[PDB]
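> run fold APNAA1
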Amino acid sequence: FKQSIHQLFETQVERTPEAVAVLSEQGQLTYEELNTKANQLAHYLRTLGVKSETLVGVCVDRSLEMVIGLLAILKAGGAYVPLDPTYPRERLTYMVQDAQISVLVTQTQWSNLISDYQGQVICLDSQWAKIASYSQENLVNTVNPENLAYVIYTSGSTGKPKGVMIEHQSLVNFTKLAIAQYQITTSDRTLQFVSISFDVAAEEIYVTLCSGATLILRTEEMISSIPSFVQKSQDWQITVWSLPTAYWHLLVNELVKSKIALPDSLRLVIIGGERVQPELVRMWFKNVGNFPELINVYGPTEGTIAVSLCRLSQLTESQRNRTEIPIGKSLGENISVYVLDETLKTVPPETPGEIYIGGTALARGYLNRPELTAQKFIQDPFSPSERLYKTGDLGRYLADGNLEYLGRVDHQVKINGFRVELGEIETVLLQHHQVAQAVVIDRRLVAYLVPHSTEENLTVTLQQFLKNKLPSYMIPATFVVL
Ligand SMILES: Nc1ncnc2c1ncn2[C@@H]1O[C@H](COP(=O)(O)OC(=O)[C@@H](N)Cc2ccc(O)cc2)[C@@H](O)[C@H]1O
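> ok
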C-alpha cells in the first residue's frame, strides 16, 4: 500500500474539507483551501522543473505560507530543504551550493539571503496573483515512496553541516505510527512550536494535518515568557503541546515557582530532544499529576524524527524515583531499536551498549557524504537486506523492557535545544589566523584556545568571526587562553 505524505494529507482533505487545517494570529485555512493553494503552487513549481528528487530550498517564516510551501513542494514531487533565515549568509549559501538547489520558495523579506543566487526564486508574499492562476487540482503520480521528502541539515564535526535525506516512506510510517500512539483526532489542536530546521516540526505538522486536527502556529513573542506561553495556549484551547525538553524544564520551574494553571484544554505534552531531569519529572508529577499525559520521545534525525517513546504519566512511583527516566520502547513493530556491543551483537538485559536503529525509520543517508554515510549507516551483518544506524547514543534495556539513555560516545551535544557538534565549532575557530589549536566543551559552551598572537579583544573578535559562519547557539559565551 504505497503512499506519500501528501497523499495521506489529501485523503484527510477529502474526508473533512471544511475543517480548519491551520490557524495563526493572522488568519486561517480550511483543509480544502490549504490543499487548493498548495496545489496551485505545486503546479507552478512543476513548470519550474521541480520533479521527483529535486531539492527545493525553503526560507519562509512561520506562517500559513510556510505550510502551503511545504505541502506544495511535496505535491510537485520535490524534497524540501529548510533554510533557516536566522543563520548567517555564508552558512545558507553553503547549503544551497551543497544541495544544488535551483528553486527557492521564500518571501520578499528574505531576498538577499543567498549570495550569488542564480536559480529560480518564488516569493509567496508578492507573487500570489500569479500562483492563483495555476490549477487547484491534486497532481497525480509525481513521486514514489522511496523518493525524498526532505533534506534537513545538521551540525557536522568535520566543519560544515550535512543534509539528512528522508524518504516519503519513512516519514509516512512515522506519521501513521505517531497519530495512533498519540491518539490524535479531528478535535485536537496542536501548537506548532519548533522551527522547520528541526525534524520535530514535521511531527507537529504532518501528525496534525494527516489526522484532521488543527495546526496552530505560534508567534516568537509567545515563548519568551512561560506565563504568556500558557495563557496564549489557553486562549487558543491547545490540546497538544510539543516541547523541546529544555523548554519543558523551564516550564516546570515556572509552573511551581508561580501558581500557574495549565490550560484546561491541554491533554498531551510531548517532550524530547535531550535527557529529561528526573527531579523535574518528580516535580511535574507532584504539582500537575497525571493529566495532561506526558510523553518522552527519543530519536535522531537520521531515524526520521523518533523511534521510541515512554509514557511518563504511566510510570510507577518507583520507576520515576530512578536516576534515569526511560526513553521507552519502539514506536512500532517495523522500527528496531537495538542496544548492541562492538561486534553488533545484542546484549543481555540491563547491559549497556550502543544504540542502533533498524527498519523503516532509517534515512536514506547523508547528502554528498559517502564516507560518513558508510560509517553511520551500516549493513546489518545478521540481516543482509537491511541497515543499522549507529546513533552514537549509549543505552540499556531494563528488565521491564524499557530503554534507558546513558549518554554519548562522542562530542555531539545539545545547546539550548539544538544539536551541536563540538568539533564543528573547534574546526571553524582553527581557520582563524590567531588560533593555533582549540577545544570547545560543554557546559554552556566554553572555548579553550592557544593563540598565535593574543590581544585583549580576542573574545569579541572570535565571536564576530563565528557570527558570520555558525548559528548563534554554536557561539561560545566564554573563551579561555594559555
Ligand atoms: N528523549 C531523549 N532523551 C535523551 N536524549 C535525546 C532524546 N531525544 C533525542 N535525544 C538526543 O538527541 C539526539 C538526536 O538529536 P536530533 O537529531 O536533533 O533530533 C531530536 O532530538 C528529535 N528528532 C527527537 C524528538 C522527537 C520527537 C519529539 O516530539 C521531540 C524530540 C539523540 O541522538 C540523543 O542524543
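Residues 147 and 167 are 5 Å apart (CA to CA).
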